[PDB]
Scaffold this active site. Sequence first.
Site, PDB file in Angstrom:
ATOM      1  N   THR C  88      46.211   7.783  17.704  1.00 40.57           N
ATOM      2  CA  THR C  88      47.011   7.742  15.671  1.00 40.57           C
ATOM      3  C   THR C  88      46.139   8.084  15.426  1.00 40.57           C
ATOM      4  OG1 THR C  88      48.836   7.946  17.028  1.00 40.57           O
ATOM      5  CG2 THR C  88      49.157   8.310  14.334  1.00 40.57           C
ATOM      6  N   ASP C 391      48.522   1.863  27.389  1.00 40.12           N
ATOM      7  CA  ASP C 391      47.885   1.586  27.124  1.00 40.12           C
ATOM      8  C   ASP C 391      47.516   0.445  26.504  1.00 40.12           C
ATOM      9  OD1 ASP C 391      48.013   4.382  25.042  1.00 40.12           O
ATOM     10  OD2 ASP C 391      48.811   4.066  23.731  1.00 40.12           O
TER      11      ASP C 391
HETATM   12  N1  LIG Z   1      50.854  -7.440  14.652  1.00 40.63           N
HETATM   13  C1  LIG Z   1      50.349  -6.376  13.760  1.00 40.63           C
HETATM   14  N2  LIG Z   1      50.322  -6.925  11.924  1.00 40.63           N
HETATM   15  C2  LIG Z   1      49.806  -6.028  11.212  1.00 40.63           C
HETATM   16  N3  LIG Z   1      48.883  -4.604  11.962  1.00 40.63           N
HETATM   17  C3  LIG Z   1      49.324  -4.518  13.361  1.00 40.63           C
HETATM   18  C4  LIG Z   1      49.944  -5.168  14.264  1.00 40.63           C
HETATM   19  N4  LIG Z   1      49.409  -4.550  15.290  1.00 40.63           N
HETATM   20  C5  LIG Z   1      49.180  -3.435  14.948  1.00 40.63           C
HETATM   21  N5  LIG Z   1      48.940  -3.135  14.005  1.00 40.63           N
HETATM   22  C6  LIG Z   1      48.143  -2.297  13.898  1.00 40.63           C
HETATM   23  O1  LIG Z   1      49.197  -1.177  12.960  1.00 40.63           O
HETATM   24  C7  LIG Z   1      48.258  -0.223  13.657  1.00 40.63           C
HETATM   25  C8  LIG Z   1      48.435   1.075  14.071  1.00 40.63           C
HETATM   26  O2  LIG Z   1      48.017   0.881  15.811  1.00 40.63           O
HETATM   27  P1  LIG Z   1      49.812   2.217  16.831  1.00 40.63           P
HETATM   28  O3  LIG Z   1      49.398   2.841  16.284  1.00 40.63           O
HETATM   29  O4  LIG Z   1      50.401   1.523  17.395  1.00 40.63           O
HETATM   30  O5  LIG Z   1      48.577   2.103  17.454  1.00 40.63           O
HETATM   31  P2  LIG Z   1      47.676   3.775  17.925  1.00 40.63           P
HETATM   32  O6  LIG Z   1      47.168   4.573  16.380  1.00 40.63           O
HETATM   33  O7  LIG Z   1      47.067   3.953  18.983  1.00 40.63           O
HETATM   34  O8  LIG Z   1      49.132   4.791  18.130  1.00 40.63           O
HETATM   35  C9  LIG Z   1      46.722  -0.574  14.240  1.00 40.63           C
HETATM   36  O9  LIG Z   1      45.178  -0.043  13.706  1.00 40.63           O
HETATM   37  C10 LIG Z   1      46.991  -2.632  14.018  1.00 40.63           C
HETATM   38  O10 LIG Z   1      45.729  -2.545  13.793  1.00 40.63           O
HETATM   39 MG   LIG Z   2      48.610   1.466  19.860  1.00 43.00          MG
END
Ligand SMILES: Nc1ncnc2c1ncn2[C@@H]1O[C@H](COP(=O)(O)OP(=O)(O)O)[C@@H](O)[C@H]1O
Ligand SMILES: [Mg+2]
Lengths: 52, 260, 532, 528, 48, 205
Positions: C88, C391
């Site tokens: 995403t 994932d």
């Molecule tokens: N606990 C957290 N606190 C702050 N940011 C986070 C946390 N967990 C994930 N993120 C951030 O949220 C963003 C989005 O992740 P996500 O959208 O779930 O992955 P993808 O892009 O594969 O769907 C990532 O760039 C990650 O750095």
């Molecule tokens: Mg992710």
Amino acid sequence: TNDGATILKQMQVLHPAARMLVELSKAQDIEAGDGTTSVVIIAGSLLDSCTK
Amino acid sequence: VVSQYSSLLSPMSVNAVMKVIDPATATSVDLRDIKIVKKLGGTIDDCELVEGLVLTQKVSNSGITRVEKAKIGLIQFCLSAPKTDMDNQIVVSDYAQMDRVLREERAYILNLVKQIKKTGCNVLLIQKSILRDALSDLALHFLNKMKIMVIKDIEREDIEFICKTIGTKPVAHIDQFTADMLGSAELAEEVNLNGSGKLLKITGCASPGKTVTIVVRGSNKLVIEEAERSIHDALCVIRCLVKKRALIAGGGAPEIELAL
Amino acid sequence: PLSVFGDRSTGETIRSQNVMAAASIANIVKSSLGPVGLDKMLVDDIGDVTITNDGATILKLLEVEHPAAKVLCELADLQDKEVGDGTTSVVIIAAELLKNADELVKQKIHPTSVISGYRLACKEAVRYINENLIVNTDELGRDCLINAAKTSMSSKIIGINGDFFANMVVDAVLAIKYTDIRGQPRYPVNSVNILKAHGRSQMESMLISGYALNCVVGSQGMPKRIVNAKIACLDFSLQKTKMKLGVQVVITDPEKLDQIRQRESDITKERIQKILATGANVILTTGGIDDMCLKYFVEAGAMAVRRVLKRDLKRIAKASGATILSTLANLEGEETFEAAMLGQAEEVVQERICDDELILIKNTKARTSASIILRGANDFMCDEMERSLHDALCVVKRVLESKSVVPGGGAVEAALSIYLENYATSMGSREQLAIAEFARSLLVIPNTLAVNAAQDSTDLVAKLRAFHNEAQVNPERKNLKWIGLDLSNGKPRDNKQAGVFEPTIVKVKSLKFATEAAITILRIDDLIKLHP
Amino acid sequence: MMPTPVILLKEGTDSSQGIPQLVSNISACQVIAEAVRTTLGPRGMDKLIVDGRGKATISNDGATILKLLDVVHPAAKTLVDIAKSQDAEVGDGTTSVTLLAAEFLKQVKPYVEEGLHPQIIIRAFRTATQLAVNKIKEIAVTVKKADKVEQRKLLEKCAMTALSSKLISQQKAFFAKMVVDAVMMLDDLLQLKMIGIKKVQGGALEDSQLVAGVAFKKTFSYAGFEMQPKKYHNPKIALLNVELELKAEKDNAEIRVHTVEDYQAIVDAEWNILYDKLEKIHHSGAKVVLSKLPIGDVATQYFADRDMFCAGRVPEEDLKRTMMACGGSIQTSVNALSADVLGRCQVFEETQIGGERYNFFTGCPKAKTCTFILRGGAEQFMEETERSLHDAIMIVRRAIKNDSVVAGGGAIEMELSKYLRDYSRTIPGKQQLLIGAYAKALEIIPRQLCDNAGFDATNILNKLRARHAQGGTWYGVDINNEDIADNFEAFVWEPAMVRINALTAASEAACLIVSVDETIKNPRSTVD
Amino acid sequence: LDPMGGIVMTNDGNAILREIQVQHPAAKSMIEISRTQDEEVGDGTTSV
Amino acid sequence: LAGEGISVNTGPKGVINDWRRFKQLETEQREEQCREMERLIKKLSMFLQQYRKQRMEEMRQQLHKGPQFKQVFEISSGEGFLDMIDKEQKSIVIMVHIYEGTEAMNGCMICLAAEYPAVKFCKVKSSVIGASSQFTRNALPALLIYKGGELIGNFVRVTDQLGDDFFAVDLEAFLQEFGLLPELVLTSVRNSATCHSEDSDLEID
Ligand SMILES: Nc1ncnc2c1ncn2[C@@H]1O[C@H](COP(=O)(O)OP(=O)(O)O)[C@@H](O)[C@H]1O
Ligand SMILES: [Mg+2]
Ligand SMILES: Nc1ncnc2c1ncn2[C@@H]1O[C@H](COP(=O)(O)OP(=O)(O)O)[C@@H](O)[C@H]1O
Ligand SMILES: [Mg+2]
Ligand SMILES: [Mg+2]
Ligand SMILES: [Mg+2]
């Protein structure tokens, strides 16, 4: 694409003169290899002058 | 669009042309000697100039990859149950014949495999066949037991390119499958393209032929197609330089000089 | 005058159209980013429902018509295939890059200069990430893998149960670890058979220290549990022996018909007796088994499973020491089955999982395998768990192969934006605008996370940029590089010590792929759409 | 969604709510601005809009183009409304207002996208607009001498700047002089209806003339009209609102007689009534008779016999203009035709212009009105010439009201942008982003000028920003010289009120668009 | 009333929810929950 | 009036675009017509015997599946019907129903499609295709069967040769005696997610 021959070939042109220009670009592609846009531009400009 | 990657592509195109011609006494370039293989995945920076050949076919003999000091053999007959040119059938009127049929079948297949292996062959290429089974399960099992890589479904129109690249002379009858009709190579292996597919590369060939293969990588299909077209344009420029070796300035200079 | 059978859009019209398409694709998945992101529900106009949060899945299920939108969709697909996470973020970054580049072009900046600036910015961003923002995982330990898995599991149906699912994922990946030539450890994920079965809660999901088959024994008369299993893997069907097409039976003396018919099945009887005479206990075959051979196995008190999937059989054979047999033909032209080609497992059972039964191959010898049985409320939830687990497994594999991770929560991209804005003032005249816009577009992700958390995006992003500017400017404040976003309290937080990580390859590949997609779209200034 | 057995609103209602609705509103405003983008500056082009009936409307005026676009987007209609408002109050700057409003919205679009509260943006726009208007009033140039020569030059320069974007730009000096003279010939209210505009097909643009008097087309002459002399050297003009022809005495009148002698007496009475009216007109001393009401053939021949001129059915507005020029009084009764109520002009003539016959009243010494006679090759040509002249006339009227000017060519807005950026650098920071966005949005007009002229707008904007930053208030775009120059010394002058109203209206439109969050569309009834 | 002509007369939660054709996906999720509870333990289908 | 040999020559070289644009729609409607004509008038112009197993098969088909039995897909477009026939492989069998005794046979198709996953039972409204008055009046119940784009079963007015109280097993036997219906444990829910990488397991030293 930026290839003149590919652009000319990919769109059907429906006009006999345009079809001859398509074959012209294909021939330039066969012999020279590139410069396929320049040859079509040159032919068009020459005929444009032929108008006047 | 590959103007940004020109720093990597232009030397590659020049090398590709110069590796398939003799610079002294050359009148034209057969671009069919240069094969472009388009594999989705990666970026255009990943384009490569493998000097052997790249085969898109997969290894049937799973569990044996990366054959070193390969002795590649290209065959044009079939490794399956015997079948004459004209229509044939085997009639069974006794259970002893029932046993003997498959016993002799496996003996025939084992003899074929032993004859192939005795030459020292360890990588085997099998031409595509539609009338007869090119490679039976029993033959594949035997070749696996003998530790021979098997790559079937080789296209008929690709035979000449493979023979030019490696040096394997095709064999159509097992009686002429000898050691001198094999193409020695330094390394034949199957590589993973970071999850975007699998490729087979035979890099390093004793007495290499006058062919090269260019692997095109890209993020999407459209940019790959345009990159292939641009590479073809560069190769064509070098070719039309080979014949009529004369160079002029570009940048609109010849046209304005002509006008004046 | 042109007279082409179709429609032609030239100039600003087609560029704005491409930007519209890319922005629409971005907005489709923009609401599903970060821990405060929410899942989406899809209907296939026949009644099928797919509750998902994965960007690649959402974009693959949608049916799209515009070509640039298709480009972004396959961009997400490629990101999923080659990395496994960030499908995403890459789409969002690509759309923002394209939008800002189109703005520059509308300002009468030639697109070639924009493309050159984007290329330079991508190269510099990758170099800066590699030399400044990577954290070696050797000084962190198993906690690093656990935190990387948990971060990958945030914003998923299994996010709250991270403390448990991360342990499962790390254990499974460490279980399927293997090394190849020249001593490079490798982790073949997708060998972890993920089996789903609704029923008990998520915490009742099991990590099988062996392999799990979605199959049952052939006949009810076979035992359902064998202690010291001797698995025999076969690749041929055990049925009545029929001669091939080229062989035909013609009878002139009636006395031999009965012998022929007897041999027709005695052949398979002899083969099965050869199999069972070596002490085999469990017989797995890819082909089918008919009732006569089922009885042959039943009388001997063995197990026989038919229609075993080829990949499952290969995994079981590799993890147990058995060898797949297409035929029982040796090199002397005989029918033999030696005991050397028998795979062994500590136990093979047939468990019952929510009114259905599956075969467990527990504690295989000569190799440690792993499989995960996911229990959920219903089918849709189980599918979402499986996707999130895939994932997480891919993320752990990336962390284990390349031992570098970067802080999460938009820290790396804020740092990149500050550095790129500072660096654009070095070379070029019109490329500086392109590099500055690259830096600006890199900030879309922390903005998206803050928006999804319903926080002050402007204020949080301003504070984050201030922290990273201070980190870059002040030599002695370099520890502020890790300052990311804490979405629960809406304040910046040191994410390196808070346990928020992601593999460096995710960010690097995301940047490269988004830049390539933006460059591909940016080259277009003319569309000719022929009638079908 | 759920079926909700009984639904709340009418079935078919459409509702859009949230950030996406606001973003779509901004995009619609962008689309509306794009339709008039290229019609700005001396290099601006024209647009041709064909309505459903087939009529074409070729114009450069922004308000006209927006009106002829049947816009129905509720958010986009605001730009058309502010263009109409700017046209009404000022008369020029209708293209600048739409560009400015759309640029404000475009500049604050990213901040909306990241969930910024609209109230903050609205307050920032209001603050920036107040500061900008104050700065315009402070730095506007005026001369406290009231010198006639300098005032005339200022009006001419303002009119030339107003006209230097239309199809009559090549003749902008000629038309500017004519427009200034026409406006200065108006007394105290500068009523537009006292400046008649007549369009006659055929002839070059330079053939068009200003009549220091009144002129109007010939109005359906009866028989015997070609006998009256068509030139007088000191005529007295009998302005009338009287029907001079044989007719019934009253609508409800009825005559009852019972003797042939009374019948003849009645016929002679009707004839004597008409002849008594004509006799009073003739003995009034007048030689030219103009009537709002018809003049019959009998009266036409009667006036021809006396070497008098008659023209009935004269349009009411033309009669008022004639009264204002010659100086008589429109009489509904021919009894008190004293010399006080009779007009008087130096020369009356009935000449031919382009296949048409026009009555000319020249030489009026104390005339308080004019009459433009525009020539051209097509009806749209003359219509667009009239539109440009209207722009110039409104600008000159406003300049008469107050002679405070600022340099055009984007100089004023570059100065305002510099001032606003300097101010915004002195506030805590949330409002700083929005005021900086306002200042950057002010740069649309010079950039649009350069884009229309075919320059490179980026280099010109860099040079302008550097020039304003280091000093020099009136440095704008030099279209002909491919560069920048001091527009005040280039006589690119605009009334300050044009920019003042443009900024005010653009700010109001931006605030109104930003405030709206939900759009609800009831199903439309009577669809046919 | 079964669409095939049959008639089901019951007060079991899963049996009732099994014969409903819904369009909203949340209702589909609820029905799947009912079936899961019935298959896993066999009782408590209305309670869940 | 002479010159009948006009030889329109250049005329249709400049007006070619309009002719081709209209001919594309004309040929589209022609292909729709060629797909729906064979549906129309083509057929409208024209004690082991007690099946003890029928009841047993009825009770077997009573338990369709676990995750509900879905519903017959309804086709709302003539072009949808056309490109639904066009898609799928040749071996895939498609069965169509035309309607406006229909409910019972619709339930029969539901039960069959539940118990015959391979076949692609579907239904369409007679008003969607827009057939003739005779078809929309007295030829509604017509089990239309397609496989590979050519007609195999063109039954019409099926309420006569199939009765009115017939059940799923009745229609199933009626179809299978024609040899028209092609000739299994129940998984937990699913097993497979993706099969793309063959990197499964290895133990290289
Ligand atoms: N606990 C957290 N606190 C702050 N940011 C986070 C946390 N967990 C994930 N993120 C951030 O949220 C963003 C989005 O992740 P996500 O959208 O779930 O992955 P993808 O892009 O594969 O769907 C990532 O760039 C990650 O750095
Ligand atoms: Mg992710
Ligand atoms: N000679 C000139 N040189 C540079 N700019 C000019 C000149 N004349 C007019 N302009 C600019 O053109 C703009 C007016 O454009 P126009 O379309 O005529 O009216 P509007 O104000 O409605 O846009 C003003 O902003 C003015 O600064
Ligand atoms: Mg070229
Ligand atoms: Mg103007
Ligand atoms: Mg109960």
